[PDB]
Design a protein around this ligand. Sequence first.
Ligand SMILES: Nc1ncnc2c([C@@H]3O[C@H](CO)[C@@H](O)[C@H]3O)n[nH]c12
Length: 246
Amino acid sequence: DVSFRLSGADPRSYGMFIKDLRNALPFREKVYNIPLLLPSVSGAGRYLLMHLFNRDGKTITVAVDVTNVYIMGYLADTTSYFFNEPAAELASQYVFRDARRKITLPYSGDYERLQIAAGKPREKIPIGLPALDSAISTLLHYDSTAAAGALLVLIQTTAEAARFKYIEQQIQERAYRDEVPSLATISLENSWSGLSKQIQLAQGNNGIFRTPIVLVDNKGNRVQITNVTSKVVTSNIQLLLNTRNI
Ligand SMILES: Nc1ncnc2c([C@@H]3O[C@H](CO)[C@@H](O)[C@H]3O)n[nH]c12
């Protein structure tokens, strides 16, 4: 299990938690030196448990599917909450079996539903380590609108920071003050699947992408990734999604 404690978290310890998280996921191969996430796992072993403590030391356990880094739901002392989606219902079979109550959130765990539910698009929700602490605290007592907002912060500061070193760096910049995510990071978040596929499709095409992944990222708008020498490949993306899951 990976843990993090916001109390006395500087940028180093976050980075260290994020390295752990990355490290708890299994992969067999590395494609172009990036870990290729297994195409599937079976059992409770498909699920990684994150223990997250806020500043007062209250904790939620979050459950992450290790095949795609997808947050399934979590446990707040005796209650578990899962998303309203099939994978999340399957997960419920293997995790938090000892909770005294199981609530299904009114929404699935994808961004479009979570933003709708929360009233703000991702671009207008501050993220940082102070936000995450807030987010943890919200989650500790049920409010389905407040949770949509915290879950949006929660996904971005754990799962998306695992996937991309850039985003893990943004959050380090925000260890003591929150700030809305950059276009660059909304773009990276959305393109993980596209990127993942093309990096794999480039083995046996000479590191060349069959289709070029255009990021807004940091060319202000409209960058285009076309082969694997690009920095988003060489230095940014940290975890690959298996093409069996795309
Ligand atoms: N509940 C969740 N937990 C982790 N990641 C996601 C995502 C991510 O949004 C992007 C797909 O368009 C991709 O990174 C998918 O992994 N949406 N919801 C998520």
